[PDB]
Amino acid sequence: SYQKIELSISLSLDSPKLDESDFILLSVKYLEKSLGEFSGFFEDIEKLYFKQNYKEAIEKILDFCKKNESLLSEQVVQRLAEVAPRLKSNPKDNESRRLYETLYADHLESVIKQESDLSVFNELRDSYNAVKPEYAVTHETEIKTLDEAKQFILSFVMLNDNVELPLKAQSERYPKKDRSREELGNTPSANPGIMKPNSPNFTDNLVPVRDVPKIAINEKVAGGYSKTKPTTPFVASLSGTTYSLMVVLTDYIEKHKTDKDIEKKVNQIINLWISSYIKEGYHSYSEVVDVLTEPFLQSIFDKANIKLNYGVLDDTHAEFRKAQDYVFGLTIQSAMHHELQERFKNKE
Amino acid sequence: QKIELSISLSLDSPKLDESDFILLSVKYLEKSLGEFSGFFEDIEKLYFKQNYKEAIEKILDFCKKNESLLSEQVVQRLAEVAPRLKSNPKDNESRRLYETLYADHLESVIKQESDLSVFNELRDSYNAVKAVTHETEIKTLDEAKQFILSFVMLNDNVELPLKAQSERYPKKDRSREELGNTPSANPGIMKPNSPNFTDNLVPVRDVPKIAINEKVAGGYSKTKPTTPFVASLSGTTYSLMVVLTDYIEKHKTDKDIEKKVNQIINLWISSYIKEGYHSYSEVVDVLTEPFLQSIFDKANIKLNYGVLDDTHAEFRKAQDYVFGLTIQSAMHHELQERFKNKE
Amino acid sequence: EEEIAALVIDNGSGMCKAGFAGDDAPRAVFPSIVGRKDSYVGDEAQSKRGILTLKYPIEHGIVTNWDDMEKIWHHTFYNELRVAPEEHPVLLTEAPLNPKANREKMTQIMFETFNTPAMYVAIQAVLSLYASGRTTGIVMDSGDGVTHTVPIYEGYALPHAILRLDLAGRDLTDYLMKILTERGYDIKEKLCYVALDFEQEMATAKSYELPDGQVITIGNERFRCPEALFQPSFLGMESCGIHETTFNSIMKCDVDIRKDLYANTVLSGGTTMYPGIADRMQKEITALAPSTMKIKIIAPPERKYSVWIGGSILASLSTFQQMWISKQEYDESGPSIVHRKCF
Amino acid sequence: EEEIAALVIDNGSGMCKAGFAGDDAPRAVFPSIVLKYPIEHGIVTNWDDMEKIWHHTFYNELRPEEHPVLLTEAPLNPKANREKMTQIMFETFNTPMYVAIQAVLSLYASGRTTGIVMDSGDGVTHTVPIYEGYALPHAILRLDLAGRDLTDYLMKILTERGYSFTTTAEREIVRDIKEKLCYVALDFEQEMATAAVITIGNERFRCPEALFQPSFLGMESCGIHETTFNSIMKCDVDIRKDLYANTVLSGGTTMYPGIADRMQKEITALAPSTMKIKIIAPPERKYSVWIGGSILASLSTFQQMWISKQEYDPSIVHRKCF
């Protein structure tokens, strides 16, 4: 009966690890199903999930719920209304976001895979080799596939703190990373963006047993990023090596501002960096995005008139839905997690 | 409500005779009603007498008067099957059951009495006409009977005068056809087939097949059809009377002769029935003749013809007989139609 | 609604055939083995023959140990049919010439041990004819332990003609062992056939294999195998064959009924499943009989489970309602009601 | 209306256990041979024959259309051996399903949802770590050694003490002895020096020592003692305390008396000198998986973790189930 899918959320909305994110994801399903013209709302709230504006959208959702309380029920609005005021997020336990983002990257890749001319990356080489020649890349005359484009683009770690330092200093934000200097180690795991190794994955979303790092959040750095931006899934820092993409790119912007397609070609790169870095576990959308979105690093784009779409796809639906499903189950099986941690306590 | 319909399912029998109506109908009443002890005892007395036509009247009239305590299925269905009931001396199987059960119940009454000394005296009244070859004094009944079953030694040649006194002995139906031998279950109930309780089954014995010559005018099976078999008009009873009259002549003003002779006659009657030779209604009918009554009138003796007061026991087991006899016929019918509704 | 459904269990010498009423198939057939959980019944035991001493409760068709037979019933009702019997009425099947005890042992069991709501015992050979849709005839039941030739008339058997042979399926298989091992080579009984004239056939004197051992040609032993039934001499039993057992049987009857019998010869059992027994029983019986009579030999194909079919067709009868034994009856008349009601 | 029951089936390598939900008793336990076994070292290999175990299961033993069905699966089952479980039941059997990890079911039986469980059956002995009631892929470890093999071992060992159990019925005798008399010994070596169906043998402590050391058999794998530790150290240092203190023995081959005290010792010495080691053995370990599932099927909330027939309208097995 359907009233077991409704109770299920009445019961999934009562877990002690529910946060701001999971609410938006479960509610929509709840609205999408309690109802069955309201197409825009699941896109308006969606756009906001990719931007981490869970704050306003929770409320708009709970404004639609009341306005359309007619086609919904007293119970859904009651419950939904009780849970919202009491909401916070923890990077460590914000894991639905992580699935979304892990799945989003693979989505931004086909896109880039559908973006044919990969010559854009090849030309970028001539700019790296002039930034750190001592560490010059000397590879395929042509980067033909994104896997080739990706590995090299991930090779900017060769550009040391030395050629990037002029840039890292002026940021006010970078001095505020909160990655502790305690080398906690490596832990083996089943999915990369969802670094949590004990996360309930779907067997479909399972990758090989790769060894992921454990990173700690130094809560005491005054101004920790995690403190200022808690929605961002796991962040102990801000993307340092992004400062390096910029060197290779500052030299490129100025050499190919002459070309008229640079607007496209710069987003092809920035988007790829954003995707591969989220898939491979190195960072989070926002860790990378907040750096390039800096007063000093945006000037370069302004001078040559480039408008960046920092990897923002407006068809993020499949990813949304897939996550709505995550929480659904995660929440039920972790609420009985204590039904049998209470029935058992009735044997002793 | 399950019991009423059953008797309504038993009343469709193609083969129900008269003796079968009484038993089930009383059984219908024994449950529907449940102060009526006077009726049921009076149905047994008539049933023993084979006076069913009078009984049926009483049964059809007992329903009108007490129709209020019954159902309307009972009260119609009897007066619907009663006028079409004809007896058949061949297929009367319930009747035979009743009397085989009384033959065991009347000999026990004489096994309950201790003086089997009447019998010894008779041998001395037997030896005057034609020991009985026996040297063990008559002590038990299994020798008193055997010596009385031995009266068959007094053959036609020594009973024939009395045969020429009867006007009913000429009218006899047994056919001269030698039909042979049947391994029966019981002897009164000779037939190969009769459901028989494990209560009444006994060692396999071979019993004769009897044929009625129905051509005879006025034959016994014809005049009185209630009596089964071919009705056993007993000619061997005439040889008894030879000894009985002679016993009355030698031992005469015996204070206890009327007691002593009823012992001889009943046991004779109950030995002949149990062993299959003849049926009650006919041992009795030979003796009812006026010249055979006379002899007992010459000494002032009144013949208690094997009649017992407490025959409820035997009555009920015939209800359980006809009930199972009738119902199994009904399922049998069903099968026939349904299977012939398969072809 | 949902008047409760009956359960029918043919307790045979070799296997137990159980099912529910108004069905066309036995739900569960399993060996009658109790090996000894405190016991193992059924095919399971057959699997653990190692540490268990298997015993067969029903021997030669009749129940010898009641201690293990109760367990073929818990198993049947409870674990192969998964029904509590308290709820469902239970017919049982019985063998010809069943003593009285066993009929009173059952009643005690299922109304006391199993607290059933209704019971009923019936000769397995009657039910077999009930499948053929006949009420009068001769049924040659041939199980795995005992083969009988029981005459049934108007719904009832004639205990005097029930004839028995201690020759059976177990035996033929066992005899075959001698001969197979006599060719220098579980079994392929599904290739054996009964010849019309064994002697001609032996004057003509096909391919069977499993992975282990070898491909084997079924020898001339194929017809010899069922020829044991016809000539039990192969088993050195002078007991007469099935052709004869049947004729002799027919003649222990009144000569009025026989014609019917010669025309209603049902063959029952799996030992009769051999192809060609049909033409043989005939050729042979015709020889021993009045050429005028009709010899019809009737072998239906549902014969292996014929006993069951008739039983279902019997408990699946509206008119069977009355026949069953209500628990109170037992609670009143004791187990003796078996005879008073199950005739 | 009545609350129709759900059904719980643990399709096993050697034996199948079906019964009915809630019941403290599984109704049926029956060898899976169809003579060919469908399930292999824990993973169904011939599916077609298993469709048959199912007919028997649903019908002949238990007497699907109106009963929901929860088949059990294994850790790290190839997942396409999952969709198919979904497909047969919904389609062939038109069931009105949820597939679960046996191990998860055992811990669940324990009354707890986090620990590491050792499950020795006949096909495979798995050591699975469960946290938050979730099977952990990066730590699941297995051994293709288990009870069936141990029976075989008892055969060889006696084969040389002179008794001979060659036949098929005879093989069952061997299983019978392993099941009971033989035991796990606390100090093998002392006990193979005190050395110096009931025809008696001193191969009572050696048969289950094969679980601890598979060398007898000739297998190059570590004892269940270590498949456990190893698996543990592939778990976050943080959760180890618990796993150590929540170790449950389960499966039928753990019915050998005394595996407990040993599991404690061997691990204890291998373990951090400071952690907390606790082994929890239920006496009902033989059937602990099932019981585990009954509870669940009878949990009010699990009722929506199932899969609707319309929800089915086979890749929902990954996304609505675990």
Author numbering:
A (entry chain H): 20 to 55, 59 to 370
B (entry chain J): 22 to 55, 59 to 154, 158 to 370
C (entry chain B): 2 to 37, 50 to 198, 211 to 230, 238 to 375
D (entry chain A): 2 to 35, 67 to 95, 98 to 130, 132 to 231, 247 to 363, 367 to 375
Q: Which lines from the publication concern this structure?
A:
To analyze the catalytic mechanism of LnaB, we solved the crystal structure of the LnaB19-371-Actin complex, which had activity indistinguishable from that of full-length protein. The asymmetric unit (ASU) of the structure contains five LnaB19-371 and six Actin molecules, which form three LnaB19-371-Actin heterodimeric complex. In the LnaB19-371-Actin complex, Actin mainly docks onto the carboxyl helix α14 of LnaB19-371 with an interface area of 1763.9 Å2. The structure of LnaB contains fourteen helixes and a long loop that folds into two subdomains: The N-terminal domain (NTD) and the catalytic domain (CD). A structural homology search of LnaB19-371 with the DaLi server did not yield any significant hits, suggesting that it is a novel folding protein. Interestingly, S261, H305, and E309, the three residues critical for catalysis form a continuous platform located in an area that has concentrated positive electrostatic potential, which may be the site for protein-protein or protein-substrate interactions. Two regions of LnaB19-441 are in direct contact with Actin via extensive polar and hydrophobic interactions: a long loop consisting of a pair of antiparallel β-sheet proximal to the S-HxxxE motif and the carboxyl end helix α18, which we designated as Interface1 and Interface2, respectively. In interface 1, T225 of LnaB engages by hydrogen-bonding interaction with K113 and R116 of Actin; N220 of LnaB forms hydrogen bonds with A170 and Y169 of Actin; T209 of LnaB contacts residues E286 of Actin via a hydrogen bond. In interface 2, H359 engages in hydrogen-bonding interaction with T148 and E167 of Actin; E370 and Q363 form hydrogen bonds with R147 of Actin. Substitution of T225, E361, or L362 with alanine indeed reduced LnaB activity toward PR-Ub.
